[PDB]
């Protein structure tokens, strides 16, 4: 499965990732590009593109326009900024059809790091409330917290 971590990565969106991968943290320059890992479960080995949603990189991902299989949205839960705007973008994913081949997870990260919204509050706000032709249970992490994640995921590959 191709699992997607998008948003601008360098924020620790990438931290979020590095934490998974080695246990470590962003010891890279804030990272625009594909970051790749394979994580093996159900031995679907999830190939993670942790990709900055920075300008080009957001702009240009067409070769990566193919067909999805897993969704992480790694979240600045202090961002409560680009999300409406995001919602406005997000529609075009919705308007993609490759994009409807994943039972997913939005991950609320960066909770400790300032705060976060109602699990619901966000849910409408990115436009998330509105799906169903993909599952849509919700899971919070932080980026110095997160557990039960895997419940979210559990259902998800086993969709």
């Amino acid at each position: 499965m191709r699992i997607l971590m998008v948003g601008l990565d360098g924020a620790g969106k990438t931290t979020v990732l590095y934490k998974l991968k080695l246990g470590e943290v962003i010891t890279t320059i804030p990272t625009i590009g594909f970051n790749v890992e394979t994580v093996q479960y159900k031995n679907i080995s999830f190939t993670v593109w942790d990709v900055g949603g920075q300008d080009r990189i957001r702009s240009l991902w067409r070769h990566y326009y193919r067909n999805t299989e897993g969704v992480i949205f790694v979240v600045d839960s202090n961002d409560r900024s680009r999300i409406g705007e995001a919602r406005e973008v997000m529609q075009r994913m919705l308007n993609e059809d490759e994009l409807r081949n994943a039972a997913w997870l939005v991950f609320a990260n960066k909770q400790d790091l300032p705060e976060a919204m109602s699990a619901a509050e966000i849910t409408e706000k990115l436009g998330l409330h509105s799906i169903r032709n993909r599952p849509w249970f919700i899971q919070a992490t932080c980026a110095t917290s997160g557990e039960g994640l895997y419940e979210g995921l559990e259902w998800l590959s086993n969709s």
Binding site: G33, F34, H63
Partner: protein, 290 residues
């Protein structure tokens, strides 16, 4: 309607790297013509940031290098920044050979958006205790100096101080070669310093100075003594290379009857010693000039 591009794609799976190798060769040959039509790029793209296969990477990489890169896609295929970050890491790689090899490549490489923080990256790599790696930077830099010298601007001195830190002859030799091309002056300052020490030392680096000195006088002189002091020491002269040059430089410098004699001798003995005829002729030719 379908094509063998695809035929290659399955092979790659089938083997892994192995099949891919085959693919590289084919690709290569295909590439060699010019020729190709795109799409495998995607494959390449897909598997390669998440894949190893070092040799293959080396093949791949080189392929990129020889082939264009300001590809009608851009400029870049357009990912020339993203993929690099792994590579940058590799370039970062603690793994010294790996960096060095990259560097080697890198000397060949010249892709700018990628370069900029790799400028930082490289700087770190210079520190690595391996002279191979460091040396490789000397080429690389050389490559910059024409392409985007400026990219780094503080360099000529930086090098020059670096020389101070330095002591690996191999690297030194290099250091000189580039240094004079950036600026002679630094070399000269050092030259002043080195003057006595030279004799002790290995030739190759010594050679490089001989060229430099030459160009400047025809434009302007007044400089002699300091040199002379050394030069006389150089009138030991003893490697066949050294000697070969040593008389040759002399004449360049001088032609006093005494000078005429000095060089002459060197030849005559030389010849006498000499064996490769091809060589012999050559000096004549000079002589013929003379």
């Amino acid at each position: 309607e379908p094509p063998s591009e695809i035929s290659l794609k399955n092979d790659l799976e089938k083997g892994d790297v192995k099949s891919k190798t085959e693919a590289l060769k084919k690709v290569i040959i295909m590439i060699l013509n010019g020729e190709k039509l795109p799409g495998l790029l995607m494959t390449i793209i897909r598997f390669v940031l998440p894949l190893q296969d070092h040799t293959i990477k080396k093949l791949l990489l080189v392929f990129w290098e020889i082939v264009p890169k300001t590809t009608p896609d851009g400029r870049l295929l357009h990912e020339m920044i993203l993929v690099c970050d792994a590579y940058r890491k590799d370039l970062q790689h603690p793994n010294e050979f790996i960096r060095g090899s990259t560097l080697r490549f890198l000397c060949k490489l010249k892709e700018a958006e990628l370069l900029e923080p790799l400028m930082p990256a490289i700087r770190a790599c210079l520190e690595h205790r391996h002279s191979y790696v460091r040396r490789n930077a000397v080429l690389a830099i050389y490559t910059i100096y024409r392409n985007f010298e400026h990219l780094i601007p503080d360099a000529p001195e930086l090098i020059h101080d670096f020389l101070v830190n330095e002591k690996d002859a191999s690297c030194k030799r290099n250091a000189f070669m580039m240094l004079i091309h950036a600026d002679q002056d630094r070399a000269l300052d050092y030259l002043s310093t080195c003057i006595d020490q030279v004799q002790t030392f290995g030739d190759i680096l010594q050679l490089v100075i001989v060229e430099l000195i030459y160009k400047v006088c025809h434009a302007n002189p007044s400089e002699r003594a300091r040199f002379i002091r050394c030069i006389y020491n150089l009138l030991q002269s003893s490697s066949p290379a050294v000697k070969y040059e040593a008389a040759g430089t002399l004449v360049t410098l001088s032609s006093a009857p005494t000078a005429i004699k000095a060089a002459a001798q060197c030849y005559i003995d030389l010849i006498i010693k000499e064996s490769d005829n091809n060589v012999k002729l050559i000096v004549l030719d000079r002589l013929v000039e003379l």
